[PDB]
Design a protein around this ligand. Structure first.
Ligand SMILES: O=c1ccn([C@@H]2O[C@H](COP(=O)(O)OP(=O)(O)O[C@H]3O[C@H](CO)[C@H](O)[C@H](O)[C@H]3O)[C@@H](O)[C@H]2O)c(=O)[nH]1
Ligand SMILES: [Mn+2]
Length: 271
């Protein structure tokens, strides 16, 4: 009973605004089919896409409210078999987005047999439901036309915002790097990994792949990392030593809310 290649539920372009007062109790009420932990499976058909949506997180509860409010209705319309994971970095030291994503990959798999992983910033919302949050033949870059970049790719190798890699694709590159502390460069490092393992980047066209980013200031412990340019230069040499095979972390707590699973983790500090 495979789901059609094109979901009959799709509406196309949508209005994304951040003025509305969002209330998770309401969102839960509006999305009665999504089960505890932000889990949903199509009732009338079998989706071949089993996706874990991973969101790196720390002190972004308000953005998260909006992300849930908008994506859950969307993800259901995309007829996907998915789960939402909020990887909350414990502590107040330097942020590490890429490491958190690795954690989400490992932790999601202990939950369900996901075959697909969508890594998404907490403040990015898609403007057209045809921009499917699933995996493809090649690593997929989803937020390809961001509002802050005038709805245009900043550079052909840009892989930030929202992306998706199948389980096999993620594994072939030894996951993402764990050694990028602070803002920047990890996406470029990941792009090097893909290219070096002979993969290419798949992208929806700019018409259907626009996203809005909730406006925000920079975070105190997520300052640009001055070592990024250098790390990008040596991805080839370091990728096999820094990623899944070297990932260490400690799960401090797990809470399953009706709309997502929150996993608080201690991922160490820069050293
Ligand atoms: O204190 C923090 C810092 C970061 N984040 C998470 O990290 C992502 C955000 O980084 P920012 O939004 O602060 O910065 P950018 O808007 O400049 O994000 C862009 O640049 C980053 C560079 O490191 C990533 O590549 C990201 O994927 C890309 O969209 C967030 O959306 C959120 O999911 C938190 O939750 N709390
Ligand atoms: Mn942002």
């Amino acid at each position: 009973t495979a789901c059609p290649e094109e979901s009959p539920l799709l509406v196309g372009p949508m209005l994304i605004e951040f003025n509305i007062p969002v209330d998770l109790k309401l969102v839960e009420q509006q999305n009665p089919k999504v089960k505890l932990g932000g889990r949903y499976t199509p009732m009338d058909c079998i989706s071949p896409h089993k996706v874990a949506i991973i969101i790196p997180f720390r002190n972004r509860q308000e953005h998260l409210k909006y992300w849930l409010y908008y994506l859950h209705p969307i993800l259901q319309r995309q007829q996907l078999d998915y789960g939402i994971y909020v990887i909350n970095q414990a502590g107040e030291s330097m942020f590490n987005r890429a490491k958190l994503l690795n954690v989400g990959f490992k932790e999601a798999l202990k939950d369900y047999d996901y075959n697909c992983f969508v890594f998404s910033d907490v403040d990015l919302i898609p403007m057209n439901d045809h921009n499917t949050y699933r995996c493809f033949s090649q690593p997929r870059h989803i937020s390809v036309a961001m509002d802050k970049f005038g709805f245009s790719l900043p550079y052909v190798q840009y892989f930030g915002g929202v992306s998706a890699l199948s389980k096999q694709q993620f594994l072939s590159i030894n996951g993402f790097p764990n050694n990028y502390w602070g803002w920047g460069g990890e996406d470029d490092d990941i792009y090097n990994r893909l290219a070096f393992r002979g993969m290419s980047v798949s992208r929806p066209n700019a018409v259907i792949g626009k996203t809005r980013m909730i406006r925000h200031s920079r975070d105190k412990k997520n300052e640009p990392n001055p070592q990024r340019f250098d790390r990008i230069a040596h991805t080839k040499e370091t990728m096999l030593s820094d990623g899944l095979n070297s990932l260490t972390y400690m799960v401090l707590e797990v809470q399953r809310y009706p709309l997502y699973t929150k996993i608080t983790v201690d991922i160490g500090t820069p050293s």
